[PDB]
Amino acid sequence: RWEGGYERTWEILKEDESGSLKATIEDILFKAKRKRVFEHHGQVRLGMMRHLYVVVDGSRTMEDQDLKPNRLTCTLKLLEYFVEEYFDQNPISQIGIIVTKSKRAEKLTELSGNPRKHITSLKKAVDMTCHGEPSLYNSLSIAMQTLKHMPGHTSREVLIIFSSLTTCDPSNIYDLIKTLKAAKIRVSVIGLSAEVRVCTVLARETGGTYHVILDESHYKELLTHHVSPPPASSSSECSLIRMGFPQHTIASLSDQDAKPSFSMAHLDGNTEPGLTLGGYFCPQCRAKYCELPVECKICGLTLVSAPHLARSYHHLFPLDAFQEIPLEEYNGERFCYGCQGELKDQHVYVCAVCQNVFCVDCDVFVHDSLHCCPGCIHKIPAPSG
Amino acid sequence: KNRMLQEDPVLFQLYKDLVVSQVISAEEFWANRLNVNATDSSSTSNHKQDVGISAAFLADVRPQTDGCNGLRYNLTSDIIESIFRTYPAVKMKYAENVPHNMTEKEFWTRFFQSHYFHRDRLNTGSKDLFAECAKIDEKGLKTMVSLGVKNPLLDLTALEDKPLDEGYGISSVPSASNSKSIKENSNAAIIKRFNHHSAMVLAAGLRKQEAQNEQTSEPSNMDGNSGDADCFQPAVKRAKLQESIEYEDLGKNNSVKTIALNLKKSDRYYHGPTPIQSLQYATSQDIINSFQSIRQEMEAYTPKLTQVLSSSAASSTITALSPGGALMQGGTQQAINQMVPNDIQSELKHLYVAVGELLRHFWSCFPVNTPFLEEKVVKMKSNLERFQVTKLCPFQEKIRRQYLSTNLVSHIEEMLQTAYNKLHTWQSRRLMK
Amino acid sequence: YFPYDYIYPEQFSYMRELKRTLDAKGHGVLEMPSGTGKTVSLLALIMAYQRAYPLEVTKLIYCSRTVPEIEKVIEELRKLLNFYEKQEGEKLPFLGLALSSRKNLCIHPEVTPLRFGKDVDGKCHSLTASYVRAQYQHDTSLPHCRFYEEFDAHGREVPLPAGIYNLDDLKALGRRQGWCPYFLARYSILHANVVVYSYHYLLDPKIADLVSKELARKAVVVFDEAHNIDNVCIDSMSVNLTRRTLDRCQGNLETLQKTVLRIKETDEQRLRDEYRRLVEGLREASAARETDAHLANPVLPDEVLQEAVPGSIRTAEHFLGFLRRLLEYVKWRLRVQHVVQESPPAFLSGLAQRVCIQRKPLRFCAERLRSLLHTLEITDLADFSPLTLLANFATLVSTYAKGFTIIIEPFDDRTPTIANPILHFSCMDASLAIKPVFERFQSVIITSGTLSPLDIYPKILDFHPVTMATFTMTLARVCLCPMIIGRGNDQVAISSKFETREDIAVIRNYGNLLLEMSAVVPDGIVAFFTSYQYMESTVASWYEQGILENIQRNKLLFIETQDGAETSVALEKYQEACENGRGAILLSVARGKVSEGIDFVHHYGRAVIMFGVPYVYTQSRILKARLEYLRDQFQIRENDFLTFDAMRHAAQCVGRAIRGKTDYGLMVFADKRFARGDKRGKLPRWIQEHLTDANLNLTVDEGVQVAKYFLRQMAQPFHREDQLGLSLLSLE
Ligand code: SF4
Ligand SMILES: [Zn+2]
Ligand SMILES: [Zn+2]
Ligand SMILES: [Zn+2]
């Protein structure tokens, strides 16, 4: 019965085209198993200066293995990567690390952009018991009251790491729809290997996007989907003003070494508990402390540092696309317009405008690292006007 | 407010010098410092295992109700308190039998020993809660009547009074319904006990925010698996329009920044007779001239031997190899000049920045004459003297020496100035009476 | 004609189903997936046939089994009314009559809020056509039945109502223009174009609720979920008789005699004028609204009650006939309580020894029961209700007994002693309940989403031109996960071999297979137990032994009560306790009447666990005569329907949570009897692609990851699922 039936599952799998060329097409189906969803982007409108809120379910669902030795191990490790790749892409923003554990919510790291503080917090978050049940109501309470004091010229989005369990919290979180719909705060959850309808209704009543974790690769995808600053609901803001351009200071300008250290509890700046020698300078406090391209606590305006953060999204929107042809128009001497090679896996990648020939390793290098076709350069800037 | 300033010694160390150096008052301490964390920092003691507890603890109240004869009194909620935080009239019943069981510890066992098993009829207090819960379900009966839709108690009743039947459908039990009379009595109470535990959500759903709509059936219920509602609708040309005008502005004004414009056109103007092309002719001639000159590389054999131009090339190397006379030992008084200002004046200065940021803030809206409050226009006046006086003796304590003082006071006078800037700018918009 | 969008290629699968069953006058049997609008499928072509008149005539009667879903039928067809209305241009006249008679009745705040239906309608009719028919004129006793008086004035008038209403419409219109549901409905039956009401109301042989005029020209009637027709029809003619009833009847025997004694000629000469008219020319005098208040026809397929005024000429003489009956009937009861005896026509024969004149006064009694009270028009109906029981009974014993069955059940069923004996008269031929239906109708279509063996329409013992198997495709990824369990570790014993109380070692792992179902599956689950004491047996070990210790911690639990009052409570909770931050799995009984009228949605309720073979197991010896008669019909049926009776209730209960076609459903099968029986009982569209593809003896611990694999994939973005646009043949 089953001793045969356990091995009727092997009968077909093991066997293939016999005689010659065996265990060959089994490898071909594995390549045919590949090539999942690429981009499907092309959007406009919103996404600028997010104010994210990490919300972590700490529950007994973590004790199931399912991808890793812990579901936090699946979670927490790639959050650091998600932190770094965020600060890579979006430095104009800041993130609220808030942890739910034992039916409450602990705002673990404040809404800020200092990566080491966030990452070591995750390195502190390693040895978490995740005792108790999830409570989103305490999480939204922090999320309200913090972002309540943020301007309406702020992007208001929440990223919830939920372990798909029972949403164990009172006090009419169904009525928190109209609370937060009016409060123009977006809330995005993704479910860990299952679905919560109420939370699924929550996000579809939000405009925040809900998903379910499939796999570790798939876990990365939706992170990567939420790296990009999304086009949230209309009528948020237009502008955001008193973007402080700073100065770097060399502390060697006119008076050479007239100050042994530029942090002595009286100097304009010197914000954090450490010694400094003068590296930076804000306009409004005239605040000189450790360099930070974010904001301050006395002038209270945004320490904008343009080549970093006014450059990041500044080309992250205006992209175009390529096309693929299997044909052989042999442009070059059977070459690439970029790296100049050939393999011909029938993916001859042609630009939409300048129409230049590329490979996967030239398409990926654009579509992950270069983000534009340089074949448009020499082709845009010469007749540009 | 006082437990806040005692349990936190760092903020107390901040709160000390406003009394020690007499910077501000306590009335001024709780007027412009906290003001936001009254919801944020006070969000700990109110929630505490999600208050307005309805569906969080109720999952765990029955399994964690007993460890042992005395496994109780953990912390605050430990294992007894949120039981009280759901039943109200039953909480009045608890209060009624604490002297009946004398010791409260005795009550913790007795009041819950017999109610846990099957049935509690030994004391008036146990019987009080027992009878009340039947009335509670009788009270819970009346509320379910008021909804009365999607409830086939209505739909079943239409088919049984009509033939005068479904009393036999009740009275048709097999399997030895003759001589036990034990669990027939028991299980219906446990049915009743967990329906109490089921309506314990209902007994705590009112605690949430009173949670009432009671369902007038909303007669549409349009099965919409189709239709393509497609809730979000972006892309009605919003950043398409920005791209058409900002790159147009990045076209007509391509980098009008510091070096980005002024050196740019100045050397384009230096190209001169470039539409005349007479320079471009000589260019294209010099393109044609040294065309051949590179490739021969006999001219470019010896484009190296100029040791005349090695010495000067060695020179600014050696010149930049030794800068000198710039106070190598720049510190070594900094340790004394750290511990003396970073004993008070790190926190003292922070007393200002908790306030002076708001001092920038009220003036950050004041000429609109909207945020013009008496609470704020004299808060302009209040801390003005409360800070710019209390720094003067920390200023005057360090002018004990002269060059030990005059280096650091080049950097503190901003605090005097950003004060006086604000004060100076205050009358740039002259306020009326 | 409402295709209106992608209709999951089914209306075309049912397009020719109409055109074969209707144009050729086909009787017709439809399979339907539970995941299909029961009317969006059907009425969209039916209402299309209402517009597409053939030779001339298109009636519509419709029935179903629950009055909320009755209105749910009405609910979206109002947009279907509006749908082509804008499309075809103008709007034509229409009427759909929800006629739930005994349910919604009186606006009057005095009559209304007394809980039951029948007794309070007796107060209503006693007021209208017994107090204000006897005491015609008056001021105080007349009271204020204005709505009936408004109907009497409106009878002369000819209004034209709008579209199809509900039972809350005539209620608010009771203070406005409506003259109450009972008569505005009588006037609207006069020109009704669509009737929806209960499957029960048509199938009342006790009071023969003749809905239309008997017009079998083209009588066009539609049937959904027509599963337990026997459990309708046999129970529709089932007659219970309490000893407590008889003694109360024994008490109002001489009570009514005192009314006879106090009335000398006042009501008596009222009889004398018209009892002579009973002899001269036979005509009912209680034919207003008292024809539906009294037993209209206990035994409908008869010729006529020609020689009325039976062997009984006077009233106390007729009263003595019941003294000859009841006092002998307890003599036919009290000694018989020692032995269960199944002798239906032998009883009336031995009765003929005891009853002096028989077989006419047996059949001509219940009207002369009523009519000799009609010259009184005094007795309140709930008082008189246990009496109308009795003259119904021997009337039924008079006419149809040789095909039917008498059963006497004195012993232990909720009486541990013999403290309430009972007998029953059942019929057996639901055919003969539905033969008059079929003769009164044209050719009318059953649709049952559970009916997998077509061989059970000859359990209805009838003929069928059209009886096929509806096959729908699923480009919705995978419709559902049917999961036969058969654990090997905890060793499946899920049929009650060692019965629900013979061993709890069986029961040691129903919690284990549930809690893990609870742990994985979110979003509310409604499971099906067998009976109430089974349910009471189900949770019996669950409290005292450690069971709920994680079960209440994961979701919560909704006990359904033997009493329907407390049963409706958790319901109020379950629709709420799912839609908040709680899964809250409901716990219920299959054969109990918690299993109809719901239509669970993807919102709440999306999984069902089988528990045991869903067969009867309870009522003794109601089987054997029912058994042997189908053994007198088909002779190998012991094995046969005693499978399907479980099966016809199984997916009746189980196959409910999936609607539309994307709504999900985890209908797992914890069962020991699966080998042929579950396979025969599951739909031929549903055994084929889904049931046991390679998953039969699926131990729960292994079957854990199945639903995990199921849902996680199936909760991915649904870009497109079987999108139909234009007509591209495909030819199924
Ligand atoms: S007739 Fe219409 S109103 Fe008069 S009793 Fe019956 S319902 Fe109440
Ligand atoms: Zn400033
Ligand atoms: Zn390339
Ligand atoms: Zn290009």
UniProtKB/Swiss-Prot annotation, chain A:
GO terms for cellular component: core TFIIH complex portion of holo TFIIH complex; nuclear speck; nucleoplasm; nucleus; transcription factor TFIID complex; transcription factor TFIIH core complex; transcription factor TFIIH holo complex. The modification Phosphotyrosine is found at residue 86. One of its GO terms (molecular function) is RNA polymerase II general transcription initiation factor activity. SUPFAM superfamilies: Cysteine-rich domain (SSF57889), vWA-like (SSF53300). Changing residue 371 to A: No effect on the transcriptional activity of the reconstituted TFIIH complex. The keyword Metal-binding applies. Pfam families: C1_4 (PF07975), Ssl1 (PF04056). It is found in: Nucleus. Its main location: nucleus. Keywords: DNA damage, DNA repair, Host-virus interaction, Metal-binding, Nucleus, Phosphoprotein, Transcription, Transcription regulation, Zinc, Zinc-finger. The keyword Nucleus applies. Residues 51-227 form the VWFA domain. Widely expressed, with higher expression in skeletal muscle. GO terms for biological process: G protein-coupled receptor internalization; nucleotide-excision repair; regulation of transcription by RNA polymerase II; response to UV; transcription by RNA polymerase II; transcription initiation at RNA polymerase II promoter. Component of the TFIID-containing RNA polymerase II pre-initiation complex that is composed of TBP and at least GTF2A1, GTF2A2, GTF2E1, GTF2E2, GTF2F1, GTF2H2, GTF2H3, GTF2H4, GTF2H5, GTF2B, TCEA1, ERCC2 and ERCC3. Component of the 7-subunit TFIIH core complex composed of XPB/ERCC3, XPD/ERCC2, GTF2H1, GTF2H2, GTF2H3, GTF2H4 and GTF2H5, which is active in NER. The core complex associates with the 3-subunit CDK-activating kinase (CAK) module composed of CCNH/cyclin H, CDK7 and MNAT1 to form the 10-subunit holoenzyme (holo-TFIIH) active in transcription. This is General transcription factor IIH subunit 2. It comes from Homo sapiens (Human).
Curated annotation (Swiss-Prot), chain B:
One of its GO terms (biological process) is transcription by RNA polymerase II. Keywords: Acetylation, DNA damage, DNA repair, Host-virus interaction, Nucleus, Phosphoprotein, Repeat, Transcription, Transcription regulation, Ubl conjugation. The keyword Nucleus applies. Residues 1-41, 67-119 form the BSD domain. GO terms for cellular component: nucleoplasm; transcription factor TFIIH core complex; transcription factor TFIIH holo complex. The keyword Amino-acid biosynthesis does not apply. One of its GO terms (molecular function) is nuclear thyroid hormone receptor binding. Residues 212-224 have a biased composition (Polar residues). The modification N6-acetyllysine is found at residue 127. It comes from the Eukaryota. Residues 208-227 are annotated as: Disordered. It is found in: Nucleus. Component of the 7-subunit TFIIH core complex composed of XPB/ERCC3, XPD/ERCC2, GTF2H1, GTF2H2, GTF2H3, GTF2H4 and GTF2H5, which is active in NER. The core complex associates with the 3-subunit CDK-activating kinase (CAK) module composed of CCNH/cyclin H, CDK7 and MNAT1 to form the 10-subunit holoenzyme (holo-TFIIH) active in transcription. Interacts with PUF60. (Microbial infection) Interacts with Rift valley fever virus NSs (via OmegaXaV motif); the interaction leads to TFIIH complex proteasomal degradation. Component of the general transcription and DNA repair factor IIH (TFIIH) core complex, which is involved in general and transcription-coupled nucleotide excision repair (NER) of damaged DNA and, when complexed to CAK, in RNA transcription by RNA polymerase II. In NER, TFIIH acts by opening DNA around the lesion to allow the excision of the damaged oligonucleotide and its replacement by a new DNA fragment. In transcription, TFIIH has an essential role in transcription initiation. This is General transcription factor IIH subunit 1. It comes from Homo sapiens (Human). The gene is GTF2H1. The chain holds residues 114 to 546 of 548 of the full protein.
Curated annotation (Swiss-Prot), chain C:
Changing residue 102 to H: In TTD1 and XP-D. Pfam families: DEAD_2 (PF06733), HBB (PF06777), Helicase_C_2 (PF13307). Residues 1-273 form the Helicase ATP-binding domain. Its cofactor is Mg(2+); [4Fe-4S] cluster. The keyword Acyltransferase does not apply. ISGylated. A motif (Nuclear localization signal) lies at residues 672-685. Optimum pH is 6.5 for both helicase and DNA-stimulated ATPase activity. InterPro entries: ATP-dep_Helicase_C, DinG/Rad3-like, DNA/RNA_helicase_DEAH_CS, HBB, Helic_SF1/SF2_ATP-bd_DinG/Rad3, Helicase-like_DEXD_c2, P-loop_NTPase, RAD3-like_helicase_DEAD. It is linked to Xeroderma pigmentosum complementation group D: An autosomal recessive pigmentary skin disorder characterized by solar hypersensitivity of the skin, high predisposition for developing cancers on areas exposed to sunlight and, in some cases, neurological abnormalities. The skin develops marked freckling and other pigmentation abnormalities. Some XP-D patients present features of Cockayne syndrome, including cachectic dwarfism, pigmentary retinopathy, ataxia, decreased nerve conduction velocities. This is General transcription and DNA repair factor IIH helicase subunit XPD.
